[PDB]
Enzyme design. Structure first.
Site, PDB file in Angstrom:
ATOM      1  N   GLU A   1      24.410  12.297   9.135  1.00 22.62           N
ATOM      2  CA  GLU A   1      25.245  11.432   9.969  1.00 22.62           C
ATOM      3  C   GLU A   1      26.449  10.942   9.167  1.00 22.62           C
ATOM      4  OE1 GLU A   1      21.206  10.208  10.592  1.00 22.62           O
ATOM      5  OE2 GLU A   1      21.985  12.247  10.840  1.00 22.62           O
TER       6      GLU A   1
ATOM      7  N   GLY B   1       2.655   5.738   8.667  1.00 23.29           N
ATOM      8  CA  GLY B   1       3.993   6.199   8.341  1.00 23.29           C
ATOM      9  C   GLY B   1       5.047   5.136   8.630  1.00 23.29           C
TER      10      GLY B   1
ATOM     11  N   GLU C   1      24.309   7.828   5.501  1.00 18.61           N
ATOM     12  CA  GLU C   1      23.194   7.703   4.574  1.00 18.61           C
ATOM     13  C   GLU C   1      23.576   7.346   3.142  1.00 18.61           C
ATOM     14  OE1 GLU C   1      24.037  10.579   6.267  1.00 18.61           O
ATOM     15  OE2 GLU C   1      22.355  11.238   7.460  1.00 18.61           O
TER      16      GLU C   1
ATOM     17  N   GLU D   1      19.923   5.593   7.565  1.00 12.70           N
ATOM     18  CA  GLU D   1      19.277   6.809   8.056  1.00 12.70           C
ATOM     19  C   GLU D   1      19.027   6.672   9.544  1.00 12.70           C
ATOM     20  OE1 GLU D   1      18.945   9.740   8.250  1.00 12.70           O
ATOM     21  OE2 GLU D   1      17.746  10.280   6.497  1.00 12.70           O
TER      22      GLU D   1
ATOM     23  N   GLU E   1      19.094  15.707  10.191  1.00 14.16           N
ATOM     24  CA  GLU E   1      20.543  15.965  10.250  1.00 14.16           C
ATOM     25  C   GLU E   1      21.331  15.070   9.309  1.00 14.16           C
ATOM     26  OE1 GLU E   1      21.696  15.303  14.248  1.00 14.16           O
ATOM     27  OE2 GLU E   1      20.645  17.074  15.051  1.00 14.16           O
TER      28      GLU E   1
ATOM     29  N   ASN F   1      18.586  10.135  11.823  1.00  9.74           N
ATOM     30  CA  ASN F   1      17.892  11.377  12.157  1.00  9.74           C
ATOM     31  C   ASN F   1      17.520  12.056  10.856  1.00  9.74           C
ATOM     32  OD1 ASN F   1      17.441  14.240  12.610  1.00  9.74           O
ATOM     33  ND2 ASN F   1      18.251  13.907  14.691  1.00  9.74           N
TER      34      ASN F   1
ATOM     35  N   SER G   1       4.454   1.953   8.002  1.00  7.52           N
ATOM     36  CA  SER G   1       4.178   0.874   7.046  1.00  7.52           C
ATOM     37  C   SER G   1       5.375   0.475   6.190  1.00  7.52           C
ATOM     38  CB  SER G   1       3.038   1.264   6.119  1.00  7.52           C
ATOM     39  OG  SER G   1       1.802   1.245   6.824  1.00  7.52           O
ATOM     40  N   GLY G   2       5.456  -0.813   5.851  1.00  6.55           N
ATOM     41  CA  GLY G   2       6.557  -1.293   5.031  1.00  6.55           C
ATOM     42  C   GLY G   2       7.784  -1.611   5.854  1.00  6.55           C
TER      43      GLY G   2
ATOM     44  N   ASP H   1      -0.209  -7.470   1.707  1.00 10.97           N
ATOM     45  CA  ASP H   1       0.420  -6.143   1.751  1.00 10.97           C
ATOM     46  C   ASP H   1       1.935  -6.216   1.838  1.00 10.97           C
ATOM     47  OD1 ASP H   1       0.514  -3.346   1.779  1.00 10.97           O
ATOM     48  OD2 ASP H   1      -0.150  -3.160   3.850  1.00 10.97           O
TER      49      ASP H   1
ATOM     50  N   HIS I   1       0.810  -1.226   0.000  1.00 17.69           N
ATOM     51  CA  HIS I   1       0.000   0.000   0.000  1.00 17.69           C
ATOM     52  C   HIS I   1       0.847   1.282   0.000  1.00 17.69           C
ATOM     53  CE1 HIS I   1       0.290   0.248   4.568  1.00 17.69           C
ATOM     54  NE2 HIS I   1       0.289   1.550   4.285  1.00 17.69           N
TER      55      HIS I   1
HETATM   56 CA    CA Z   1      20.232  11.767   8.749  1.00 20.71          CA
END
Ligand code: CA
Lengths: 235, 59
Positions: free
Chosen positions: A62, A183, A65, A55, A60, A57, A185-186, A89, A41
């Site tokens: 780090e 939010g 990422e 990831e 910001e 924060n 989800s997944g 799903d 979905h």
């Molecule tokens: Ca970050």
């Protein structure tokens, strides 16, 4: 995630966040260097998607990422076969360039159908994500995580009017106050087996968040691991 | 057997002949010397945390 706590950098290195028409709108888990597994979905095509592994924060830098573009999306063939049931799903996202595995970017382990279910039955998993920390409330900047107890299917069924299929399971607390939420989800529902984590669920749906009497509903990964392995082979 | 304690296998267990038990591991891992525990075979095996568990330390 409602009622959880901040994760530490590198605590869930298989966790990624998805960005698109909306920023940090869903989560996902690293299957391997080129593939991510998420909820169907979250990626109803008609939009470009970007993935960020390592990831921690959202606001910001780090320096851990790794951002990648999604070149292919494969939702389970039976997702949306019926309307608004949220059954099946789960979806896979292929990356444009491979991630470079390291301490902050590590795949989640995926056992066979037999063992994924065995691990789920231990009855205690971890969910995480950058979703809402309050029902209808704001989202998190720092990744959140929460330990959630498996709920007996029989009590799972009696907690809602909606249908809980054999492709789903309930997890959460009877008292409420702690739950995954919109939010997240997944993102993964994982089970730690002597220091090694295996993907046991996909954060999928619920009725509001953290409401007493209600539980988070998750996609039962054991029913889909053959499919996952079949579509994510590297050459 | 695998009956109790997963046949003393850290990850996967499967029944062998004469009620024996053969342990196995997921990708990125290798069966240890004791034939039950699993050890990393690649730099970054799936499912493990490799950042100094809560701040750096020394052992
Ligand atoms: Ca970050």
């Amino acid at each position: 995630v409602v009622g959880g706590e901040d994760a530490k950098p590198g605590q869930f290195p298989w966790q990624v966040v998805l960005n698109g028409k909306v920023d940090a709108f869903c989560g996902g888990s690293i299957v391997n260097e080129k593939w991510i597994v998420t909820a169907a979905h979250c990626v109803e095509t008609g939009v470009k998607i970007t993935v960020v592994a390592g990831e921690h924060n959202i606001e910001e830098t780090e320096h851990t990422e790794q951002k990648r573009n999604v070149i292919r999306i494969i939702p389970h063939h039976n997702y949306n076969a019926a309307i608004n049931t949220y059954n099946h799903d789960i979806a896979l996202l292929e990356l444009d360039e491979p991630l470079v595995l390291n301490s902050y970017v590590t795949p989640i382990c995926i056992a066979d159908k037999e063992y994924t279910n065995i691990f789920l039955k231990f009855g205690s998993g971890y969910v995480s994500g950058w979703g809402r920390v309050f029902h209808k409330g704001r989202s998190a900047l720092v990744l959140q995580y929460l330990r959630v107890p498996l709920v007996d299917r029989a009590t799972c069924l009696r907690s809602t009017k909606f249908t809980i299929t054999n492709n789903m399971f309930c997890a959460g607390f009877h008292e409420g106050g702690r739950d995954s939420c919109q939010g997240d989800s997944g993102g993964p529902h994982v089970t730690e087996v002597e220091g090694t984590s295996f993907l046991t669920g996909i954060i999928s749906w619920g009725e509001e968040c953290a409401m007493k009497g209600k539980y988070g509903i998750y996609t039962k990964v054991s029913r889909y691991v053959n499919w996952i392995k079949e579509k994510t082979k590297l050459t | 057997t695998c009956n109790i304690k997963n046949g003393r296998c850290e990850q996967f267990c499967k029944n062998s002949a004469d009620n024996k038990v053969v342990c196995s591991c997921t990708e990125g891992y290798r069966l240890a010397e004791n034939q039950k525990s699993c050890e990393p075979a690649v730099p970054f095996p799936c499912g493990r945390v490799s950042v100094s568990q809560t701040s750096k330390l020394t052992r």
